[PDB]
Each structure stands twice: as structure tokens, then as C-alpha cells.
UniProtKB/Swiss-Prot annotation:
Source species: Phyllomedusa sauvagei (Sauvage's leaf frog)
Task of the protein: Potent antimicrobial peptide with activity against bacteria and protozoa. Also has activity against fungi. Also shows activity against enveloped herpes simplex virus type 1. Probably acts by disturbing membrane functions with its amphipathic structure. Binds to healthy erythrocytes (this binding is receptor independent), and has strong hemolytic activity. Does not bind to P.falciparum infected erythrocytes, but accumulates within the parasite. Kills the parasite, and only at high concentrations has a hemolytic activity on the host cell. In vitro, shows high spermicidal activities.
Tissue: Expressed by the skin glands.
Protein's cellular compartments: Secreted
Name of this chain's protein: Dermaseptin-S4
Family statement: Belongs to the frog skin active peptide (FSAP) family. Dermaseptin subfamily.
Amino acid sequence: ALWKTLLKKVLKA
């Protein structure tokens, strides 16, 4: 993930 999912993953970056 990196911008369309990494944001959702961003919680766990």
C-alpha cells in the first residue's frame, strides 16, 4: 500500500 491503501495502512504506516 502507498497512497490509495497506505493511508488506510498508514494507521500502521
